[PDB]
Amino acid sequence: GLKAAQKTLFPLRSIDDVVRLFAAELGREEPDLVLLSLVLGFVEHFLAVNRVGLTYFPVADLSIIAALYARFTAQIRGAVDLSLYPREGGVSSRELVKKVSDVIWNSLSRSYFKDRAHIQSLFSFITGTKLDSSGVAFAVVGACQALGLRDVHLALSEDHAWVVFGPNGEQTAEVTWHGKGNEDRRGQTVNAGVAERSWLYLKGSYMRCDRKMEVAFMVCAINPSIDLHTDSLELLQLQQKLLWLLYDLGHLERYPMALGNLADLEELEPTPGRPDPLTLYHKGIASAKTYYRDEHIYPYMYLAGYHCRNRNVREALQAWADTATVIQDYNYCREDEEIYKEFFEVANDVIPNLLKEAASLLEAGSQGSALQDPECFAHLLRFYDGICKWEEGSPTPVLHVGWATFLVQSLGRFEGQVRQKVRIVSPVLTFQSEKMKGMKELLVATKINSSAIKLQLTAQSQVQ
Numbered sequence: 001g002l003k004a005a006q007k008t009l010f011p012l013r014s015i016d017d018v019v020r021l022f023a024a025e026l027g028r029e030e031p032d033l034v035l036l037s038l039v040l041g042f043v044e045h046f047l048a049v050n051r052v053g054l055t056y057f058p059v060a061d062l063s064i065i066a067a068l069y070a071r072f073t074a075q076i077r078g079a080v081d082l083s084l085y086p087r088e089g090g091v092s093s094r095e096l097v098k099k100v101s102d103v104i105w106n107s108l109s110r111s112y113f114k115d116r117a118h119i120q121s122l123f124s125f126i127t128g129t130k131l132d133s134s135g136v137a138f139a140v141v142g143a144c145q146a147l148g149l150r151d152v153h154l155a156l157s158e159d160h161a162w163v164v165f166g167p168n169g170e171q172t173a174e175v176t177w178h179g180k181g182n183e184d185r186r187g188q189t190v191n192a193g194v195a196e197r198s199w200l201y202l203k204g205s206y207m208r209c210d211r212k213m214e215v216a217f218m219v220c221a222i223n224p225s226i227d228l229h230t231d232s233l234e235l236l237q238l239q240q241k242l243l244w245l246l247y248d249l250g251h252l253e254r255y256p257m258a259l260g261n262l263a264d265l266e267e268l269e270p271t272p273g274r275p276d277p278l279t280l281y282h283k284g285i286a287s288a289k290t291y292y293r294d295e296h297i298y299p300y301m302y303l304a305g306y307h308c309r310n311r312n313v314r315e316a317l318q319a320w321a322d323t324a325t326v327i328q329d330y331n332y333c334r335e336d337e338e339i340y341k342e343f344f345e346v347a348n349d350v351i352p353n354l355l356k357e358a359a360s361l362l363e364a365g366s367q368g369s370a371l372q373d374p375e376c377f378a379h380l381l382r383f384y385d386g387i388c389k390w391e392e393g394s395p396t397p398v399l400h401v402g403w404a405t406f407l408v409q410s411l412g413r414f415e416g417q418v419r420q421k422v423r424i425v426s427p428v429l430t431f432q433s434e435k436m437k438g439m440k441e442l443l444v445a446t447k448i449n450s451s452a453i454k455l456q457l458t459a460q461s462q463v464q
Ligand SMILES: CC1(C)CN=C(N2CCN(c3ncnc4sc(C(F)(F)C(F)(F)F)cc34)CC2)S1
Pocket: 134, 156, 157, 158, 159, 160, 161, 217, 220, 257, 258, 261, 298, 301, 302, 305
C-alpha cells in the first residue's frame, strides 16, 4: 500500500540510507509510521537480536519490507470495518479507537515476558505477535493512520502512553496496560488520573504528539542492547543520527525525554560540531518549562545523572533538589511507584555513595568539596523537603524509617560548622514541608540527634 515515491530509496544498505528514508518521510505531509517502524524493527532485529551472518548492515530489500507492510495493513483493514463507525467531521469516535485497540490486543501472544527488549516495533508485532506496553499504544496510532484517521495521536507521560483523538484532539482514550498487576482502564479517559494530580498523568501536562513527534518516539524506542554488557554500535549510531535529524527539523522542541536521550548518546560518543551534553540536558529542562509547566521530573533526573557520573557532587545535588521541587506539588498515588523507586534509589543509594566517596576525598585533602559547601547542604535539605511536601495530602505515605537511617548518615557527612551556615527562613533556604520545618533546630547540632530526626521524618509517635 506504499506509494511509488516511498519505494525509491530501497534497498537500504546502510545507516545513512535509513536516515535518508526518515528524512524523506519527514518531508512528507504525513510520515508513514507503519513503514518507518517496520524498517527500524527489521534493522534492530538483525543488529541486536540475531547478528548471525552480519557483515556490515542488514540490507532492507523493498520486497521484504513491502511484504511486512502488507501483512500489517491487511490485518488492520480486514478486522476494522470503518463503515460501522461513521466519522462525523474528519474526527474519529471512541468506539472506533476502542475497536482498533482491541484488534491490536487480541493479536498478541496469550503469554510472554512483557518487559523484554526488542518487542517495541511493528516488526515485533508482525513476526513475533509481541508488543510492550507503549508498543501497543504506538501500534494503535500506526493502525489508525493506516486507516486514514488523521486525528488519532499518541499521548505520553513519563511512565505511560495512550491516545488523543476526536473534535479538536480533545478526547483521551486508554489503549494499553500500565505496569504489572494494575487493572487496565482501556477505552476510558485519563481524566480521573489528571484530577487526582498523580505523577502518572502529569496534572495534564503530558505530551500530545503530532505525527513528527510520533516519529521521534519510535526513534527514542530503538534499543541497541545486545545483552547486559554489550550494545550495538550500529544501532547507537543510527539512533543518534536520527535524533539529530529530528532535532534539526524542530521535532524535539516539545520532547524533553528525547533531548535527554540525545544528550546521553553524545556523552557516550560526541558528534563533532554539536552542542555538549550539558547544553542538551538544559534544553530538555527548558522544553519542560516552556511547554509542560515545568511539571516533568525526568529532565532534572537526566541532568543529575550526568553530574553524578562525572562526580560533579554539587551540581548533582542541585539537580536532585530541583527534581524534588517538581514532585512536591503532586499527590503520590497508586500507579506512581516507578518515580517512588527513582527517588528511593537517589536518597538511599546514590547520594550515600556519592557522599561516602566525597568524605574519603576530603580526608585526602580535597578543596572546594561539596561537603564543605553550605550551598550543597542546602540542596540536600531541599531534596528532602520536596519529598516530604510530596507526601503531604497524598493518599499513600512516602517516608518510612528505611529513609531515616540514610538521612541521618547523609546529614552527618557535613560537619556542624558547615551545617550552621545555612539560614532557614520562614545560603538561604525556605522549607515548604512541615516535616522539614520541625527538623530545623536538629539540622545544626554538632552531634546530630539521630533518634529525634527519625521521629521527625516518620512522624513516629512513640519510642521503646
Ligand atoms: C533520567 C532517567 C532516569 C533515565 N532514563 C529515563 N527514561 C528513559 C527513556 N524514556 C522515554 N524516552 C522517550 N520517550 C518516552 S515515552 C515514555 C513513556 F511514556 F513512559 C512510555 F511510553 F510509557 F514508555 C518513556 C520515554 C523513559 C524515561 S528517565
